[PDB]
Amino acid sequence: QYSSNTQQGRTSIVHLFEWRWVDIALECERYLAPKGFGGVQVSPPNENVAIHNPFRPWWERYQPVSYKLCTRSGNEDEFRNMVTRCNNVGVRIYVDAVINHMCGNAVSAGTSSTCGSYFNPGSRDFPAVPYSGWDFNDGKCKTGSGDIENYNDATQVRDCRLSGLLDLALGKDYVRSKIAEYMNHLIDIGVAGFRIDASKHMWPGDIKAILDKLHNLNSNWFPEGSKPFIYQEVIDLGGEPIKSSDYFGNGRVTEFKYGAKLGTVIRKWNGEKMSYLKNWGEGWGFMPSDRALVFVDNHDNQRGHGAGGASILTFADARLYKMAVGFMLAHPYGFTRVMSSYRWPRYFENGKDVNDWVGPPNDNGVTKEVTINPDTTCGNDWVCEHRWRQIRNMVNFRNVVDGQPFTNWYDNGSNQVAFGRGNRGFIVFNNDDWTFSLTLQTGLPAGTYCDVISGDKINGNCTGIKIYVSDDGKAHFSISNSAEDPFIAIHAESKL
Template identity: 40%
Template structure:
């Protein structure tokens, strides 16, 4: 029997380098078998594999990196541990086990938000701050969770009387829509703008206030203290200009819907940051 080439599977639109696959439960498929399937593809695709790390288990995420990217479940647990029980200052060298260029990272996903020690939408502002850090930090390929509310871990999404899943309505309490929350959604643009740059100008107060730049493309301040961070100036590598704080607003044709900050010729700007809040500036948000 001659196997059907995988390229004969019809696509809804012409394939491009953006085509790709997520392999669910890849851990239950030998890495060599996935490699054999991948070898039959005649066009380049993006591939990432769900491989959940389990302490002491014989199958590890590292076995699958030769095939493509791999989910790094340890990332969300380690990030939550720092936000919940340690100090944000410890994030200075934050990374997980997989190589950065092959790790798919997330604060939470549909499994861990039910059965894991991670931050979820139920953690409110802390969850937003953690996502902001993930999207600003140069480790892994970040993935943002978008979910629905639940009290029973086994509950499915909101459904109509017929049992059919209802259309998503981000104005309804049943749908969390984390990807639409401004402090997360705007940081996706930050992530895209700063790609390819390293961390510069790290600062922390030894506890739960941190700040760092991404080359001359962006700068993030996070204050997870119970009190405001006041009377401080921050040094960046951003060009001089007035920047929209995308943590609280977005760029419009006429300026910014939130506060703005002026970076002087020496790279300094002054900001007071409320408790459990932040400031995010990037080169694409220079409004004057």
């Protein structure tokens, strides 16, 4: 469950948050494959509650009504077509699996769901599964409200209702079997693994019992005996009884300390600075590298949900965000996930965004297609971070340096730092208020290299900055603090 199952030499996944299946399939073919992306995390593919107040929020997708593959992203046929077309070009698909709970206990009964299935939360009736009152934890929870009241009590965190969401009885074999049926349907289609949503709210032993029922990956694309890649969402920032390490038996775990601390460093908040990143990783108290799923922001914390945190960097602070993402992709710690977002009407009212619920770009609830502008950016209000040159070219940097040791570290005692990955790549950052200009040891063979942050290599020339590495591996770097991108990266495949 720890191996990504990506094609050899592809090292990252991109979260195409709320994108339609037909758009993802085209994106695999035209962009992700030739650019070396390993895989795509998709939003929940299972039928959910259509919530009309507020209007079609992104979060309605975390309120399941059935395991039918019918959502605003498209139907079962479109889902199958996407997975096929992606695997056929060597790009994997990872599913966001919502298995802790069904919908909110106070949603009205009826057929207001993305596939028209009837459901009755009040009587616990979900006949398209089917589930009944017998399949929920109402009798097991011991709080007055039936909802989670206290994160200091590990038992109620697992047995009671997260924010009123109907809590599935994952202790019983019937429920475990219905969930396993859904996941096996996905695996046979050609899915390479799963983000397990709300993992903190399930017993690690109940997750195990469901994963024991899973098939091996589809033998047309994957070697015999391949297991789905599993990464679990657990928010463990310290100081509560549940620990991310309680989940290592099942797969990888999301390391939320990563993006909170890196955002603080890059913003230079709290007395922190880039020279302290010399021991980034386990030195900062993070979980082991071989268990971590890392990221700068995710779909929750980029809009103040989940753990939130003011330090989080997102597309909305583009200049610092590209640097943070650039550091993450150059550094060997963890398995990396890049976010891909949409814009929404951000409106603050006593220091909270009251529009944090807004769903993807839409026409009366119908998801807008991803259009591609002539300069290769996206229209219709999709951000497409994954197509920003500085991010895409760092996704390739990580592939080119895969397996190479962290070496040749330099720092000025403040916010000018540089490091190498073996003899395959070198990266230089200026986050200080003055120019960085210095001759440094790169570890690279002699030659002319294109800086892949400012430009691209094409036809034996560069479109941006060029760096000249001499016979002893040294090169001069000059980065103004006023630079729009104040970092430089070169690697073995950017050499002329």
